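Hi all, posting the design record for the shared folder.

TITLE: backbone redesign
STEP: 1 of 1
STRUCTURE INPUT:
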């Protein structure tokens, strides 16, 4: 089951605050996915969500309004719900009020909205044809909940989207999601790693101390060999490595390697051999 539909399942039995909030949520369904025909007295809803379809049926039941037909129009296939038109449906001003607006948002989201699995993306969207509706919705999201949302063009439709995981949680909780807010936080909190600047400094020092102690140990090993047997009496490939280290004592192993067409690991293996040889003569 998609993460999005799991969120929508939580909303199927959210309370019906009042008749006004019920009609406001229905208007959300109507605006997003309703093909309205006042003359023939019907509304055709096209829904890709079963959670959304069940919520729509529960709203119509609350209002005591009959739904006449439920069919699948033959992934791209969708649910067609035909219901009776009532002028009361269109009388509500859904933005005027945070209670009315939250119900409108729930309707918009259930019918035409979706949300990405936050393990992969931060994305919650609402698809809508009308341009005014989307702008007004975006303004009310900001005024009421301080939620910043962008807008996207798709020719067939336009998308309102929220990319802040903070704003997404506020949005979801506002419309009545509960269980899944905990799962989202466990995912968000688990991607995080916080702080210690002193731990960072400690780590950087430790690596620098390792590198310095190694380099000193290389130099010391080369000096002992030079004193006791002569570098000229090393195997040719170790001899060049000993000289390059001794002549370039502040270079990294990578940079020492470049001077002999050797990789860092190659020059490092040779330095280890040189140190092994120098144990003969003294502490290294
Ligand atoms: Na050199």
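Okay, here is what came back for every position:
SEQUENCE:
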């Amino acid at each position: 089951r998609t993460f999005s539909e799991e969120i929508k399942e939580e909303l199927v039995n959210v309370p019906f605050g009042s008749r006004e909030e019920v009609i406001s949520e229905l208007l959300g369904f109507i605006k997003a996915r309703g093909d309205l025909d006042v003359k023939s007295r019907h509304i055709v809803f096209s829904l890709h969500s079963f959670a959304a379809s069940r919520r729509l049926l529960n709203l119509m039941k609350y209002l005591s309004k009959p739904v006449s037909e439920i069919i699948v129009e033959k992934k791209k296939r969708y649910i067609k719900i035909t219901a009776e038109y009532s002028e009361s449906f269109m009388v509500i001003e859904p933005f005027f009020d945070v209670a009315l607006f939250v119900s409108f948002l729930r309707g918009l989201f259930l019918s035409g909205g979706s949300m990405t699995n936050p393990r992969y993306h931060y994305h919650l969207e609402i698809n809508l044809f009308e341009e005014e509706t989307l702008a007004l919705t975006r303004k009310s999201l900001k005024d009421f909940f301080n939620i910043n949302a962008g807008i996207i063009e798709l020719r067939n439709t336009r998308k309102l989207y929220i990319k802040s995981i903070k704003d997404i949680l506020v949005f979801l909780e506002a419309i009545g999601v509960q269980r899944k807010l905990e799962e989202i936080d466990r995912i968000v909190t688990e991607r995080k790693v916080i702080g210690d600047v002193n731990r960072t400094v400690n780590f950087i020092e430790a690596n620098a101390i390792r590198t310095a102690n190694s380099t000193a140990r290389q130099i010391r090993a080369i000096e002992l060999i030079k004193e006791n047997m002569g570098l000229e009496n090393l195997p040719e490939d170790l001899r060049r490595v000993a000289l390059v280290r001794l002549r370039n004592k502040e270079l990294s192993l990578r940079e020492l390697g470049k001077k002999l067409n050797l990789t860092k690991s190659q020059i490092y293996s040779k330095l280890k051999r040189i140190i092994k040889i120098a144990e003969r003569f003294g502490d290294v």
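COMMENT: The beta strands are 34-37, 42-47, 67-73, 78-84, 113-115, 124-128, 150-153, 158-162.
Let me know if anyone wants the other runs.
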